[PDB]
């Protein structure tokens, strides 16, 4: 359950992210693939080189979807419902991967906005990424 304080922190986080959706999105994926190699097997048709166009394009889409959840933070479900079946039913993504991606995003944020990533903000964003990925893993069964 996201509290008013948590939502306020998440929005504070996104205003920092806005303007760097592609840059941060790409690095998030780059850290996912480099740190957890197994993750690459989900993208066989992707050139996984450092800053490939495909990774930048996809990284942008992913972070842009997160932006959507921030905008409709009161009801993340309906905001990302179109991605739920895609990930769980069609792609059958193993749910452990959502934690790896959430962690990867947090690392990118710590790198670029250490002062912003206070313990309190870290808590809110972790709860947020958890709720966001819960929506994408809610259609398994």
């Amino acid at each position: 359950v996201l509290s008013p304080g948590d939502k306020a922190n998440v929005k504070t986080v996104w205003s920092k992210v806005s303007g760097h959706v592609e840059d941060y999105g790409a690095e998030t994926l780059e850290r996912l693939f480099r740190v957890y190699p197994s993750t690459k097997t989900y993208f066989p048709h992707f050139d996984l080189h450092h800053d490939s166009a495909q990774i930048r394009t996809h990284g942008k889409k992913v972070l842009t979807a997160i932006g959507e959840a921030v905008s409709h933070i009161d009801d993340i479900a309906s905001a990302l419902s179109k991605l739920s079946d895609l990930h769980a039913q069609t792609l059958r993504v193993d749910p452990v991967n959502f934690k790896l991606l959430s962690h990867s995003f947090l690392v990118v944020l710590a790198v670029h906005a250490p002062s912003l990533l206070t313990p309190e903000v870290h808590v809110s964003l972790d709860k947020f990424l958890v709720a966001v990925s819960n929506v994408l893993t809610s259609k398994y069964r």
Binding site: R34, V107, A110, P119, E120, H122
Partner: protein, 146 residues
């Protein structure tokens, strides 16, 4: 699983720049704050009533320092990690029953703390090396299989 020469170099390089007190206090505090149920293991630390309280708790700081110094023991001999933590394994697992999941979480917290402190120097490749290190320590701390 085995550390490559590059990974060994990232680990030693970053470790050389690490202030164990500073990094350790921050990591232990964040563990207690981001994953509050872990506070059940540190009753003797006193005031853990809030983020600021935890962040300013002297016992948290001192213990955090010891935690990072321990990671330092892993750094000094990356190939002997299992042995280096065997005893601490008896302490955390056999005695305290700390569920192994928490080791991973502290590992994740440390990675984030290193990232915040080192900025762009903490590259994806550097993180990958550190992720292998924390994961190896976490594994050596869990129940010992023969």
């Amino acid at each position: 699983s085995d550390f490559t020469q590059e990974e060994r170099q990232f680990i030693v390089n970053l470790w050389g720049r690490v202030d164990v007190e500073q990094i350790g206090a921050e990591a232990l505090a964040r563990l207690l704050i981001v994953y509050p149920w872990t506070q059940r293991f540190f009753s003797s630390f006193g005031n853990l009533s809030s983020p600021s309280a935890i962040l300013h708790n002297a016992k948290v700081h001192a213990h955090g320092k010891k935690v990072l110094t321990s990671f330092g023991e892993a750094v000094k001999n990356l190939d002997q990690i299992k042995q280096t933590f065997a005893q601490l394994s008896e302490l955390h697992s056999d005695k305290l029953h700390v569920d192994p999941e928490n080791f991973k979480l502290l590992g994740n917290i440390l990675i984030i703390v290193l990232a915040a402190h080192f900025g762009k120097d903490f590259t994806p490749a550097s993180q990958a090396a550190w992720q292998k290190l924390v994961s190896a320590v976490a594994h050596a701390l869990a129940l010992r299989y023969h």
